[PDB]
Amino acid sequence: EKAIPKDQRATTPYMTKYERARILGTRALQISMNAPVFVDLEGETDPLRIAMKELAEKKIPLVIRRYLPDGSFEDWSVEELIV
């Protein structure tokens, strides 16, 4: 229940494949629910493709909460997780 503060963070600084897939799914679901996007569609209508473009421009407004087995967690913004 106690958040590990941003200054120290034990878990990997890289986005995992599962984190990428879940972020894309969540953002695509939000877009499919008419959420505003922060990228240039250039004619794109697919929420998944728009979410992929957002992830490419590193503009998805979500943060990954990685719970440790000991019950704690640390937050990693999508932008600060590197691919």
Partner 1 sequence: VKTAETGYMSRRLMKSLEDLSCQYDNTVRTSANGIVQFTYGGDGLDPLE
Partner 2 sequence: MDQENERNISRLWRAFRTVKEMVKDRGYFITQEEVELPLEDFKAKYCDSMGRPQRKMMSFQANPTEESISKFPDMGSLWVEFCDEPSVGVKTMKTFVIHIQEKNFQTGIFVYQNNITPSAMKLVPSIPPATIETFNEAALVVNITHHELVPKHIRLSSDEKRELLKRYRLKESQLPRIQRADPVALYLGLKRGEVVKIIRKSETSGRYASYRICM
Partner 3 sequence: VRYDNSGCLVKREDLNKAEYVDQYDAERDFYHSLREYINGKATALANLRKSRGMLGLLEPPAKELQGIDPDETVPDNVKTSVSQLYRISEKSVRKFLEIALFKYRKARLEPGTAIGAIGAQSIGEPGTQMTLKTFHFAGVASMNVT
Which residues sit at the interface with partner 3, rule CB under 8 A?
11-12, 14, 16-19, 66
- The nearer residue to partner 1, 32 or 72, going by C-beta atoms, is 72
Nearest distance from residue 55's CB to partner 3, in Å?
17
Longest dimension (CA), the chain: 46
Residue corresponding to tokens 């590197």: 82
- Of the CA atoms within 13 Å of residue 77, those in its CB half-sphere come to 7
| Residue ranges of E strands in the chain | 63-67, 73-77
Answer for which of 68, 77, 79, 83 binds partner 2 (CB under 8 A) is: 68
**Binding interface with partner 2 (CB under 8 A):** 68-70, 72
